[PDB]
Design an enzyme around this catalytic site. Structure first.
Site, PDB file in Angstrom:
ATOM      1  N   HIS A 183       0.881  -0.885  -0.127  1.00 25.58           N
ATOM      2  CA  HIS A 183      -0.330  -0.359  -0.107  1.00 25.58           C
ATOM      3  C   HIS A 183       0.819   0.962   0.332  1.00 25.58           C
ATOM      4  CE1 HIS A 183       0.779  -0.806   4.386  1.00 25.58           C
ATOM      5  NE2 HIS A 183       0.557   0.586   4.780  1.00 25.58           N
TER       6      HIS A 183
ATOM      7  N   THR B 110       3.404   4.814  -3.659  1.00 27.63           N
ATOM      8  CA  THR B 110       4.742   4.052  -4.213  1.00 27.63           C
ATOM      9  C   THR B 110       5.612   3.903  -4.350  1.00 27.63           C
ATOM     10  OG1 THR B 110       5.187   6.810  -4.157  1.00 27.63           O
ATOM     11  CG2 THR B 110       4.675   6.635  -6.010  1.00 27.63           C
ATOM     12  N   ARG B 111       7.231   3.080  -4.820  1.00 27.15           N
ATOM     13  CA  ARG B 111       7.919   2.145  -4.052  1.00 27.15           C
ATOM     14  C   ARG B 111       8.966   2.346  -5.344  1.00 27.15           C
ATOM     15  NH1 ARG B 111       5.043   1.610  -0.401  1.00 27.15           N
ATOM     16  NH2 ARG B 111       4.990  -0.243   0.423  1.00 27.15           N
TER      17      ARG B 111
ATOM     18  N   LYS C  60       6.659  13.238  -0.926  1.00 26.92           N
ATOM     19  CA  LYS C  60       6.930  11.906   0.431  1.00 26.92           C
ATOM     20  C   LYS C  60       8.139  10.996   0.693  1.00 26.92           C
ATOM     21  CE  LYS C  60       5.488   7.500  -0.820  1.00 26.92           C
ATOM     22  NZ  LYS C  60       5.474   6.048  -0.631  1.00 26.92           N
TER      23      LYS C  60
ATOM     24  N   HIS D  94      14.474   5.173   7.786  1.00 32.61           N
ATOM     25  CA  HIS D  94      14.574   3.791   6.493  1.00 32.61           C
ATOM     26  C   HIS D  94      15.168   3.168   7.525  1.00 32.61           C
ATOM     27  CE1 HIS D  94      15.813   0.397   4.018  1.00 32.61           C
ATOM     28  NE2 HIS D  94      16.632   0.177   5.172  1.00 32.61           N
TER      29      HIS D  94
ATOM     30  N   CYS E 206       2.667   0.986   7.144  1.00 29.89           N
ATOM     31  CA  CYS E 206       3.408  -0.095   6.565  1.00 29.89           C
ATOM     32  C   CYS E 206       3.978  -0.879   7.236  1.00 29.89           C
ATOM     33  CB  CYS E 206       4.368   0.394   4.909  1.00 29.89           C
ATOM     34  SG  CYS E 206       6.081   0.282   5.563  1.00 29.89           S
TER      35      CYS E 206
ATOM     36  N   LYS F 195      11.583  -2.942  -5.860  1.00 32.41           N
ATOM     37  CA  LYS F 195      11.556  -2.555  -6.468  1.00 32.41           C
ATOM     38  C   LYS F 195      11.914  -4.571  -7.584  1.00 32.41           C
ATOM     39  CE  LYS F 195      15.373  -0.497  -4.331  1.00 32.41           C
ATOM     40  NZ  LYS F 195      14.374  -0.790  -2.955  1.00 32.41           N
TER      41      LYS F 195
HETATM   42  C1  LIG Z   1       7.126  -0.826   4.487  1.00 28.39           C
HETATM   43  C2  LIG Z   1       7.121  -0.202   3.890  1.00 28.39           C
HETATM   44  C3  LIG Z   1       8.398  -1.511   2.226  1.00 28.39           C
HETATM   45  C4  LIG Z   1       8.873  -0.666   1.458  1.00 28.39           C
HETATM   46  C5  LIG Z   1       9.113   0.713   1.594  1.00 28.39           C
HETATM   47  C6  LIG Z   1       9.108   1.535   2.637  1.00 28.39           C
HETATM   48  C7  LIG Z   1       7.785   0.979   3.726  1.00 28.39           C
HETATM   49  C8  LIG Z   1       7.437   1.507   4.382  1.00 28.39           C
HETATM   50  N1  LIG Z   1       9.670   1.784   0.469  1.00 28.39           N
HETATM   51  C9  LIG Z   1       9.992   0.600  -0.586  1.00 28.39           C
HETATM   52  C10 LIG Z   1      10.434   1.534  -1.374  1.00 28.39           C
HETATM   53  O1  LIG Z   1      10.779   2.691  -2.322  1.00 28.39           O
HETATM   54  N2  LIG Z   1      11.287   0.822  -2.659  1.00 28.39           N
HETATM   55  C11 LIG Z   1      11.400  -0.810  -2.571  1.00 28.39           C
HETATM   56  O2  LIG Z   1      12.157  -1.523  -3.354  1.00 28.39           O
HETATM   57  N3  LIG Z   1      10.535  -0.829  -1.923  1.00 28.39           N
HETATM   58  C12 LIG Z   1      10.479  -0.401  -0.585  1.00 28.39           C
HETATM   59  N4  LIG Z   1       9.652  -1.340   0.532  1.00 28.39           N
HETATM   60  C13 LIG Z   1       9.378  -2.984   0.733  1.00 28.39           C
HETATM   61  C14 LIG Z   1       8.148  -3.091   0.035  1.00 28.39           C
HETATM   62  O3  LIG Z   1       6.799  -2.450  -0.034  1.00 28.39           O
HETATM   63  C15 LIG Z   1       8.387  -4.616   0.406  1.00 28.39           C
HETATM   64  O4  LIG Z   1      10.018  -5.500  -0.059  1.00 28.39           O
HETATM   65  C16 LIG Z   1       6.955  -5.558  -0.855  1.00 28.39           C
HETATM   66  O5  LIG Z   1       6.078  -4.892  -0.828  1.00 28.39           O
HETATM   67  C17 LIG Z   1       6.487  -6.726   0.876  1.00 28.39           C
HETATM   68  O6  LIG Z   1       6.909  -7.317  -0.630  1.00 28.39           O
HETATM   69  P1  LIG Z   1       5.795  -9.614  -0.524  1.00 28.39           P
HETATM   70  O7  LIG Z   1       5.004  -9.587  -1.202  1.00 28.39           O
HETATM   71  O8  LIG Z   1       6.738 -10.177   0.198  1.00 28.39           O
HETATM   72  O9  LIG Z   1       4.880  -8.376   1.286  1.00 28.39           O
HETATM   73  P2  LIG Z   1       3.261  -8.392   0.442  1.00 28.39           P
HETATM   74  O10 LIG Z   1       3.301  -7.479  -0.364  1.00 28.39           O
HETATM   75  O11 LIG Z   1       2.624  -7.266   1.976  1.00 28.39           O
HETATM   76  O12 LIG Z   1       2.697  -9.575   0.003  1.00 28.39           O
HETATM   77  C18 LIG Z   1       2.465 -10.349   1.466  1.00 28.39           C
HETATM   78  C19 LIG Z   1       0.565 -10.501   0.871  1.00 28.39           C
HETATM   79  O13 LIG Z   1       0.560 -11.926   1.940  1.00 28.39           O
HETATM   80  C20 LIG Z   1      -0.547 -12.307   2.687  1.00 28.39           C
HETATM   81  N5  LIG Z   1      -0.111 -12.879   3.476  1.00 28.39           N
HETATM   82  C21 LIG Z   1       0.361 -12.847   4.919  1.00 28.39           C
HETATM   83  N6  LIG Z   1       0.027 -13.648   5.563  1.00 28.39           N
HETATM   84  C22 LIG Z   1      -0.835 -14.838   4.691  1.00 28.39           C
HETATM   85  C23 LIG Z   1      -1.947 -16.176   5.235  1.00 28.39           C
HETATM   86  N7  LIG Z   1      -1.342 -16.534   6.763  1.00 28.39           N
HETATM   87  N8  LIG Z   1      -2.381 -16.827   4.262  1.00 28.39           N
HETATM   88  C24 LIG Z   1      -2.828 -15.837   3.103  1.00 28.39           C
HETATM   89  N9  LIG Z   1      -1.935 -14.659   2.762  1.00 28.39           N
HETATM   90  C25 LIG Z   1      -1.680 -14.387   3.216  1.00 28.39           C
HETATM   91  C26 LIG Z   1      -0.942 -10.462   2.676  1.00 28.39           C
HETATM   92  O14 LIG Z   1      -2.166 -10.372   2.022  1.00 28.39           O
HETATM   93  C27 LIG Z   1       0.208  -9.683   1.604  1.00 28.39           C
HETATM   94  O15 LIG Z   1      -0.914  -9.305   0.611  1.00 28.39           O
END
Ligand SMILES: *Cc1cc2c(cc1C)nc1c(=O)[nH]c(=O)nc-1n2C[C@H](O)[C@H](O)[C@H](O)COP(=O)(O)OP(=O)(O)OC[C@H]1O[C@@H](n2cnc3c(N)ncnc32)[C@H](O)[C@@H]1O
Ligand code: NA
Length: 371
Positions: free
Chosen positions: A43, A46-47, A258, A262, A307, A340
């Protein structure tokens, strides 16, 4: 009976689904919610994307391949660019280990990076203000990504390609047979030949032993103006302070800049513990130390986010097949710099699914490291 079950169809899993279905596999996609949501780490608008990578030389070929896939994906949507080429400026002291890895990795991979002077940057961008001791490394072909859009598209593309998608249904446990992988959900029981685990920042309460620690992080929107924009050639940034504190930032969208810290953030353990933007009181003034020094004409915080970092103990990624099962692959170490890579990580998972070939060496993302 599926060819592949994706546990978390989030940022990594959304890619994984699209690529694995386009590869021609019988894929099941699962999430706990409706993929482009507010409960993961995808959410916010941007990233950031950086090629010349200060975190380590080990990341470069992967992010280069990632960029290719982002370019291929952005093709599918004309009105909305998924990748925006705003460029990325890397700011920090001349004698810093981080900028030392940006300059070295730019050289080997023949990347478009300009060394810029402290007075040079102020002369090119009047709004950016650094100490005289400082240096800047401008990356031309970099920029940022529309993170929410990236999911949205990866899902519809998979959904059209005949992918079976079970979304608002959390997974509750992973079970292993001898053929493939079973996942029991609060719904029913499904199985596949292979599995990729990308539940992200809460994978801990589905696979408890992992050495990954969720941490509450926050980014915010401050009041900017037209001269801080992509129109006025203002670039997305990463900064170091004499503190050693790292900050990331994006070119003002519609009169909003924004930023986010880190290195800090308060440690949590439950999804419930992620208190929204203004609830803990560092938040509204977290990006201030960077802003008053580096971007002094930037004004007040307007709104912000909520986040979570999926931190590993050495801050590097964990990309490895499970200790007891070559059957299943997990991606989880992504400690706040992983989006990324989303596109490339989905591809290597799609490759893994049809027992195919890497190109990259994923040695430094061993699970073995610890101990
Ligand atoms: C926290 C954060 C991260 C971040 C950032 C700024 C913040 C505050 N800025 C970034 C940036 O400028 N450039 C960049 O390259 N990365 C940046 N990040 C990191 C990035 O947000 C994360 O690395 C990435 O988006 C997360 O990857 P991942 O795919 O592993 O995690 P997710 O997107 O949240 O997806 C996980 C999904 O799985 C579902 N889930 C969780 N538990 C379950 C269970 N048990 N059963 C079924 N599904 C499950 C979640 O709902 C989620 O959708
Ligand atoms: Na993360």
């Amino acid at each position: 009976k599926y060819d592949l079950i994706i546990i978390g169809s989030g940022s990594v899993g959304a890619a994984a689904g699209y690529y694995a279905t386009r590869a021609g596999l019988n894929v099941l996609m699962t999430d706990a919610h409706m993929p482009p949501h507010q409960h993961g780490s995808h959410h916010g608008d941007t990233r950031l994307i950086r090629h010349a990578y200060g975190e380590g030389e080990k990341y470069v070929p992967l992010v280069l391949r990632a960029q290719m896939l982002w370019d291929e994906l952005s093709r599918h949507n004309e009105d909305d660019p998924i990748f925006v080429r705003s460029g990325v400026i890397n700011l920090g002291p001349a004698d810093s280990t981080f900028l030392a890895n940006v300059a070295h990795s730019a050289e080997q991979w023949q990347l478009n990076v300009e060394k810029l002077d402290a007075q040079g940057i102020m002369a090119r961008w009047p709004e950016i203000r650094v100490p005289d001791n400082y240096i800047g490394l401008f990356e031309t072909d970099s920029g940022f990504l529309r993170s929410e859009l990236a999911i949205k598209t990866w899902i519809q593309l998979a959904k059209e390609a005949g992918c079976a998608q079970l979304f608002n249904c959390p997974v509750t446990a992973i079970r292993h047979d001898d053929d493939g992988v079973t996942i029991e959900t609060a719904d029913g029981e499904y199985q596949a030949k292979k599995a990729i685990v990308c539940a992200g920042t809460w994978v801990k309460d589905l696979l408890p032993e992992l050495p990954v620690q969720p941490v509450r992080k926050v980014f915010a929107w401050y009041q900017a103006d037209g001269r801080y924009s992509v129109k006025n050639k203002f670039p997305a940034f990463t900064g170091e302070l004499p503190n050693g504190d790292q900050y990331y930032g994006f070119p003002a969208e519609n009169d909003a800049l924004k930023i986010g810290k880190h290195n800090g953030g308060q440690v949590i353990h439950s999804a419930d513990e992620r208190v929204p933007f203004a609830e803990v009181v560092s938040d509204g003034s977290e990006a201030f130390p960077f802003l008053r020094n580096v971007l002094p004409g930037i004004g007040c915080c307007l709104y912000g986010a909520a986040c979570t970092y999926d931190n590993s103990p050495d801050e590097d990624f964990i990309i490895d097949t499970l200790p007891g099962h070559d059957n299943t692959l997990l991606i989880t170490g992504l400690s706040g710099h992983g989006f990324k890579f989303a596109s490339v990580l989905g591809e290597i998972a799609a490759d893994f699914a049809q027992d195919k070939k890497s190109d990259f060496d994923l040695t430094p993302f061993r699970l073995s490291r610890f101990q």
